[PDB]
Structures are given as structure tokens and as C-alpha cells.
UniProtKB/Swiss-Prot annotation:
Shown residues in whole-protein numbering: 344 to 455 of 801
Note: Some specific inhibitors of BRD2 that prevent binding to acetylated histone are promising therapeutic molecules for the treatment of cancers or inflammatory diseases. ABBV-744, a small molecule, has been tested on tumors with success: ABBV-744 antiproliferative activity is mainly restricted to cell lines of acute myeloid leukaemia and prostate cancer and is able to displace BRD4 from chromatin. GSK046 (iBET-BD2), which specifically inhibits the second bromo domain, is a promising therapeutic small molecule for the treatment of inflammatory and autoimmune diseases.
Subunit structure: Homodimer. Interacts with E2F1. Interacts with (acetylated) STAT3; promoting STAT3 recruitment to chromatin. Interacts with CTCF; promoting BRD2 recruitment to chromatin. (Microbial infection) Interacts with herpes virus 8 protein LANA1.
Organism whose genome encodes this protein: Homo sapiens
Name of the protein described by the UniProt record: Bromodomain-containing protein 2
Biological function: Chromatin reader protein that specifically recognizes and binds histone H4 acetylated at 'Lys-5' and 'Lys-12' (H4K5ac and H4K12ac, respectively), thereby controlling gene expression and remodeling chromatin structures. Recruits transcription factors and coactivators to target gene sites, and activates RNA polymerase II machinery for transcriptional elongation.
Domain Bromo residue range list: 2-111
Family per record: Belongs to the BET family.
Gene it is expressed from: BRD2
Subcellular location(s) of the protein: Nucleus; Chromosome
Free-text comment on this protein's domains from its UniProt entry: The first bromo domain specifically recognizes histone H4 acetylated at 'Lys-12' (H4K12ac). It also specifically binds histone H4 acetyl-methylated at 'Lys-5' and 'Lys-12' (H4K5acme and H4K12acme, respectively). The second bromo domain recognizes and binds histone H4 acetylated at 'Lys-5' and 'Lys-12' (H4K5ac and H4K12ac, respectively).
Annotated consequence of substituting L41A: Reduced binding to histone H4 acetylated at 'Lys-12' (H4K12ac)
Length: 113
């Protein structure tokens, strides 16, 4: 019934949408932690100090780690920022991040208050 609970329900709804089949064609690079070694990205952890991905956001939501919508939004935006920091801006994965961030920002803006 409380404001923070209602806002976190909205956040959980957004999280479910970002993980849904509707967005899977561009969301899939953000499903799991970047496996830098497996992808040959041996500079990844020198450039990205705070990795973030949607499985980590889901674990934190399930564990009641997020106390408010702003904390949730900070992790989702960190995930996008990491992609924009690491990758040249004309790379495919950046286009995919920008499309998923459009989904995120437009729905986040509909936060109940
Ligand atoms: C998240 C994330 N941020 N950067 C990457 C990434 C960077 C370089 C190479 C692969 C990469 O992720 C796998 C991938 C994505 C798109 C298309 C093909 C592979 N992934």
C-alpha cells in the first residue's frame, strides 16, 4: 500500500518487460554478466569498475536489496552506461542498449507518484 512498495512494483514490472520475449532480439546482451574472458574482452574489467546486468538486477529485486525506485534505476542505467563507456558508439551492442534504454526510460517515466 505504501509509496515505496508501489514504486518498486512498477520497477519489478519494468524489469519483467526488459526480460520478456517482446524485447529479446535487442535485450539478450544484457541478460547475464559480461563474461570478459569468454568473449576475449581482456580490457573489460580495466574500463568497467562496476559491472551490472539484468540477472543481477533481478537477484537484487528478489533479495529485497532495492529500498526505492531510484536505487533500481541507478543499476539499470549503470548497465547501459557500462555499454556506452566500453564500446565504440557505432557498434551493434550500443544500438541494442539504446533501444532497450528507450523501453526503460519511457516506462520508468510513468512511475506512480
Ligand atoms: C553488455 C555488453 N556490453 N558490451 C558487450 C560486448 C562488447 C563486445 C563484444 C561483445 C559484447 O557482447 C556480446 C555481443 C553483443 C551484441 C552482439 C554480439 C555480441 N556486451
Amino acid at each position: 500500500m505504501g509509496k515505496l512498495s508501489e514504486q518498486l512494483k512498477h520497477c519489478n514490472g519494468i524489469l519483467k518487460e526488459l526480460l520478456s520475449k517482446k524485447h529479446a532480439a535487442y535485450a539478450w546482451p544484457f541478460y547475464k554478466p559480461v563474461d570478459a574472458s569468454a568473449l576475449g574482452l581482456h580490457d573489460y574489467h580495466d574500463i568497467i569498475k562496476h559491472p551490472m546486468d539484468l540477472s543481477t538486477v533481478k537477484r537484487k529485486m528478489e533479495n529485497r536489496d532495492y529500498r526505492d525506485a531510484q536505487e533500481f534505476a541507478a543499476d539499470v542505467r549503470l548497465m547501459f552506461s557500462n555499454c556506452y563507456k566500453y564500446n565504440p558508439p557505432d557498434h551493434d551492442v550500443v544500438a541494442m542498449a539504446r533501444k532497450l534504454q528507450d523501453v526503460f526510460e519511457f516506462r520508468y517515466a510513468k512511475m506512480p507518484d
